[PDB]
Amino acid sequence: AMSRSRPELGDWSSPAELAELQRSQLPRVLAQALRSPFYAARYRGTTPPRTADDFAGVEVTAKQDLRDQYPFGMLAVGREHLATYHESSGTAGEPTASYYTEEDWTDLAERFARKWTGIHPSDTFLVRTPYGLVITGHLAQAAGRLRGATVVPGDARSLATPLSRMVRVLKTLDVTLTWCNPTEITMLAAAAKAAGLRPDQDFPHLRAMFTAAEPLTEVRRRRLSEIWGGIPVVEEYGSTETGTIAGQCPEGRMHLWADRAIFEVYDPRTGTLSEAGRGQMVVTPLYRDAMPLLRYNLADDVEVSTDPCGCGWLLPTVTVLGRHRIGPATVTQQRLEELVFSLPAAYEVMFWRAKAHPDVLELEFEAPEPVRQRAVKELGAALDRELGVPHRITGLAPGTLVPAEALTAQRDILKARYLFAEDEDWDKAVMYF
Amino acid sequence: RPELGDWSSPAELAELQRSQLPRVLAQALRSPFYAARYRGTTPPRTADDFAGVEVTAKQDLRDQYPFGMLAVGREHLATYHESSGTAGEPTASYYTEEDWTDLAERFARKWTGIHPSDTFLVRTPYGLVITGHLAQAAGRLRGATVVPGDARSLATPLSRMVRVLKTLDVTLTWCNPTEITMLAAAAKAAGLRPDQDFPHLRAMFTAAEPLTEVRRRRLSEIWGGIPVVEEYGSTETGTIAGQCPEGRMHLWADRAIFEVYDPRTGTLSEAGRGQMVVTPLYRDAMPLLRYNLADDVEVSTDPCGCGWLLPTVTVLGRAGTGHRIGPATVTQQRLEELVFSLPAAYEVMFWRAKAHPDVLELEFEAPEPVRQRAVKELGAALDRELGVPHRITGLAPGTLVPAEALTAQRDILKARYLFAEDEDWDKAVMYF
Numbered sequence: 001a002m003s004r005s006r007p008e009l010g011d012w013s014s015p016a017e018l019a020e021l022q023r024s025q026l027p028r029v030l031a032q033a034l035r036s037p038f039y040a041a042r043y044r045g046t047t048p049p050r051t052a053d054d055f056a057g058v059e060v061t062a063k064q065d066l067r068d069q070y071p072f073g074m075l076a077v078g079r080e081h082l083a084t085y086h087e088s089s090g091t092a093g094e095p096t097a098s099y100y101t102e103e104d105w106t107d108l109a110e111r112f113a114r115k116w117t118g119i120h121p122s123d124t125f126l127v128r129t130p131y132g133l134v135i136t137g138h139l140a141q142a143a144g145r146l147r148g149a150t151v152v153p154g155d156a157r158s159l160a161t162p163l164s165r166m167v168r169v170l171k172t173l174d175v176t177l178t179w180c181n182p183t184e185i186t187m188l189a190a191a192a193k194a195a196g197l198r199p200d201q202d203f204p205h206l207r208a209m210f211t212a213a214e215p216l217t218e219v220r221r222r223r224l225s226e227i228w229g230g231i232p233v234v235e236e237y238g239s240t241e242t243g244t245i246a247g248q249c250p251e252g253r254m255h256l257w258a259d260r261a262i263f264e265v266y267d268p269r270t271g272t273l274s275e276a277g278r279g280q281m282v283v284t285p286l287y288r289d290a291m292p293l294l295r296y297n298l299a300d301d302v303e304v305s306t307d308p309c310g311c312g313w314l315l316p317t318v319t320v321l322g323r324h325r326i327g328p329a330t331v332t333q334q335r336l337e338e339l340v341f342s343l344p345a346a347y348e349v350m351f352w353r354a355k356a357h358p359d360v361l362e363l364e365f366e367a368p369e370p371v372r373q374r375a376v377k378e379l380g381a382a383l384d385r386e387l388g389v390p391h392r393i394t395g396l397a398p399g400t401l402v403p404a405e406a407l408t409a410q411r412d413i414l415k416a417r418y419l420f421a422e423d424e425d426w427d428k429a430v431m432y433f
Numbered sequence: 434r435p436e437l438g439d440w441s442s443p444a445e446l447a448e449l450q451r452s453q454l455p456r457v458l459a460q461a462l463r464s465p466f467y468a469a470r471y472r473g474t475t476p477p478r479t480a481d482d483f484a485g486v487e488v489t490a491k492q493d494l495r496d497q498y499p500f501g502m503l504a505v506g507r508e509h510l511a512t513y514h515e516s517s518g519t520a521g522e523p524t525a526s527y528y529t530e531e532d533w534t535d536l537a538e539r540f541a542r543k544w545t546g547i548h549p550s551d552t553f554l555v556r557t558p559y560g561l562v563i564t565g566h567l568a569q570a571a572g573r574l575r576g577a578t579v580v581p582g583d584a585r586s587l588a589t590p591l592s593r594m595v596r597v598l599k600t601l602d603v604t605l606t607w608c609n610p611t612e613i614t615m616l617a618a619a620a621k622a623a624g625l626r627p628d629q630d631f632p633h634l635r636a637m638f639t640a641a642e643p644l645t646e647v648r649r650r651r652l653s654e655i656w657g658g659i660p661v662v663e664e665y666g667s668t669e670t671g672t673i674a675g676q677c678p679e680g681r682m683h684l685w686a687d688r689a690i691f692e693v694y695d696p697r698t699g700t701l702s703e704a705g706r707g708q709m710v711v712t713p714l715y716r717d718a719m720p721l722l723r724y725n726l727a728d729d730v731e732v733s734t735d736p737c738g739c740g741w742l743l744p745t746v747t748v749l750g751r752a753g754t755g756h757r758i759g760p761a762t763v764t765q766q767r768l769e770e771l772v773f774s775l776p777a778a779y780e781v782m783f784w785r786a787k788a789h790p791d792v793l794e795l796e797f798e799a800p801e802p803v804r805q806r807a808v809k810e811l812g813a814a815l816d817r818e819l820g821v822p823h824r825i826t827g828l829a830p831g832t833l834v835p836a837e838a839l840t841a842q843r844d845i846l847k848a849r850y851l852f853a854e855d856e857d858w859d860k861a862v863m864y865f
């Protein structure tokens with residue numbers, strides 16, 4: 001406890017103390033950055049930044065820089081010192097590489113593990129995010145290991161672990177915590193109902209759901225909580241190349257982990273960087289060796305506030321607005337989402353999609369037949385009142401956007417076989433997935 | 434825990450094993466399964482009493498789902514797993530941190546070594562099964578850079594694994610032997626020669642299916658003559674045998690008592706032909722007493738040229754069961770040796786066969802100029818070596834393994850709800 005190497009909540013009593021925790025790490029950080037081919041080349045000829053003061057002059061690092069430096073242009077240590085290598089989600093054609101030492105991994109795990117509900121050895125923790133190149137599954141599992149929780153590696157987007165099998169695991173293993181994106185929370189609820197289980201009653205050991213990766217309105221988050229019996233839905237904000245940079249407090253806001261990174265809001269028009277306001281999320285992580293980043297622009301649209309929260313945490317808050325005009329009206333996924341998830345929970349509307357045409361908003365959603373026409377009418381009124389856009393809203397039969405087989409299919413985990421008996425299906429010979 | 438070199442004879446090995454049995458028998462009796470099994474009676478407590486210990490069947494692990502085999506409080510578990518095979522009847526297994534050190538050490542017994550300078554591509558599943566987690570933990574134990582490929586995942590198609598193999602200078606892979614050929618076919622589709630264009634690739638680790646020496650040597654040749662290092666394991670046991678430099682798998686008998694079960698007689702011997710029985714010696718969470726993995730195996734105590742003081746094991750599994758086809762008996766093992774005895778220039782890697790009562794139906798891919806020579810030579814080989822009537826069909830590449838499997842690229846999408854007029858909104862809630 002005495003010789004803990006990185007700060008934790010409670011180590012500062014003021015914003016000036018926080019700023020000194022940050023400033024004191026900058027000489028080590030600037031020295032480590034200069035070991036990478038990217039920064040050594042950037043500061044070739046000139047004198048590199050070495051002091052906290054020099055940081056004010058440090059040029060933004062763009063997503064496009066990380067892509068151009070693929071794979072190891074940002075690497076500051078020998079490859080012998082790397083523990084894991086990762087690529088970000090998004091375009092497969094233009095990969096974003098990131099990589100971490102064991103010591104880098106302790107910082108990552110500690111940041112994920114800042115869940116206000118706690119992670120305890122008595123928890124059974126279902127990790128239902130991908131383990132394929134992306135960090136998300138590995139990050140949750142490492143936080144689970146750090147805190148002693150029993151980790152169930154569900155993975156996501158894998159033929160080994162369909163939703164039917166995840167519902168069975170949730171129920172029969174008395175799972176206490178989940179990690180999955182907010183769409184997966186509704187997919188698991190629909191799979192539960194398909195198996196004849198009520199998400200709001202039949203999972204009494206489930207005490208919290210951890211989520212990230214999508215823009216999530218308070219309206220949808222509250223509905224996800226309600227679907228699963230009113231348990232906490234605990235949001236964090238991160239990326240493969242940064243780790244977790246903000247986490248929810250008990251009052252439902254995400255706070256920036258400023259003890260572990262310098263956070264700045266970038267106005268691309270102005271080219272200026274401030275500590276707060278509206279603009280693009282810029283990050284300087286303070287406790288990484290392998291892949292130093294100096295003012296990395298995640299290029300997410302964010303609002304950062306230094307206004308105190310009811311939680312009492314001495315950290316700024318962040319709303320993530322995401323990274324369409326129909327006549328004058330701007331329509332965001334966020335605004336439509338608040339209207340869709342304001343429908344009464346009894347209508348069981350979870351799955352929807354919209355297309356922004358120049359002239360009209362096309363919107364489709366699944367609802368059971370009895371409530372479909374009520375739902376279409378109420379959502380139409382809500383769009384008229386709140387957005388005033390012309391719309392074509394179509395109610396769909398369940399199983400049309402999210403097929404019954406996604407919710408109920410069971411899939412044997414087969415190995416390759418080459419010789420078959422007459423009565424066997426040899427179409428699973430070499431293609432056994 | 435012992436390492437190779439800690440015993441100088443089979444009697445010393447047996448004493449390393451016997452000395453752990455009191456702790457193991459005591460830990461087993463903490464589980465509801467063994468407590469119930471030995472209810473009323475006095476339980477086995479000594480090395481000598483082990484000779485009387487009843488086999489534990491696969492069906493027992495299934496019946497005890499989920500935590501009937503659990504010997505510690507759930508607070509002490511690190512990870513929970515389910516085995517490959519039938520989804521309808523899950524086999525649960527689970528491990529403490531200390532259980533995980535034994536698992537990682539056993540996997541890390543690769544005669545080629547795992548070193549911090551290695552870049553290690555883990556191309557097996559992380560979904561409930563242990564295999565991806567096991568390789569990653571061994572990688573971490575030894576300081577190798579782990580690239581988590583995963584397998585059976587939409588995030589990591591073959592095209593992307595081939596790109597990573599090449600551009601990251603990958604030195605080691607972990608994937609089943611069919612995935613070794615799938616990566617070779619995907620390599621060619623990306624314009625890369627498996628036998629020349631991956632000069633940093635120094636070894637390929639493999640397991641999970643019956644593998645003849647003939648096929649293993651061909652996999653090595655496809656990838657430029659580098660070592661193909663086989664292990665034998667299961668989700669519920671971990672790695673129980675690993676390859677030596679002479680190309681045989683040795684049982685990790687310092688970490689588990691191995692016995693061959695004859696199902697008709699119900700007897701257990703140290704060696705011979707029968708079903709693989711395992712008593713792991715260094716696990717707390719899920720003690721197993723003579724667990725019958727029910728794989729068909731031959732164990733030999735004949736000394737190996739490698740000088741390792743451990744018995745060797747061939748694993749037949751399902752690949753050893755004879756199908757009767759007219760006069761002859763055919764195993765997958767024997768067919769495999771004939772298919773992979775075709776000249777390497779024919780590029781025959783993907784095949785399948787059906788045992789009919791009257792005839793062996795066999796299909797395989799071979800590129801166009803050589804396809805008919807391949808069909809003729811494989812026909813002659815079957816006549817000379819098996820004498821089965823056969824119908825052999827040579828297929829164009831892309832028939833058994835479609836070109837799309839080898840070349841498809843898939844963006845890793847999040848859910849999107851709002852789309853622009855010109856976008857495909859059939860990626861909305863089904864974004865996988």
Ligand SMILES: Nc1ncnc2c1ncn2[C@@H]1O[C@H](COP(=O)(O)O)[C@@H](O)[C@H]1O
Pocket residue numbers: 088089090134211212213214215216235236237238239240241298300320321322323
């Ligand atoms: N809580 C969140 N709210 C909104 N967007 C998020 C959130 N968490 C992550 N994201 C988005 O997901 C990106 C990270 O993608 P990846 O590198 O694949 O994890 C971020 O840069 C954001 O665009």
Ligand SMILES: Nc1ncnc2c1ncn2[C@@H]1O[C@H](COP(=O)(O)O)[C@@H](O)[C@H]1O
Pocket residue numbers: 516517518562564639640641642643644663664665666667668669726728748749750
């Ligand atoms: N080297 C190997 N040779 C043959 N079969 C193997 C080998 N390794 C694993 N297996 C098979 O895979 C099973 C374990 O499956 P899983 O629990 O999914 O790892 C074993 O019981 C065998 O049937």
Ligand SMILES: [Mg+2]
Pocket residue numbers: 079080081082083549550551576577578
């Ligand atoms: Mg390394």
Ligand SMILES: [Mg+2]
Pocket residue numbers: 088089239240241
């Ligand atoms: Mg990203």
Ligand SMILES: [Mg+2]
Pocket residue numbers: 121122123148149150507508509510511
């Ligand atoms: Mg635990």
Ligand SMILES: [Mg+2]
Pocket residue numbers: 516517667668669
């Ligand atoms: Mg198994």
Ligand SMILES: [Zn+2]
Pocket residue numbers: 249250251252253255309310311312313
């Ligand atoms: Zn707060």
Ligand SMILES: [Zn+2]
Pocket residue numbers: 677678679681683737738739740741
């Ligand atoms: Zn040997």
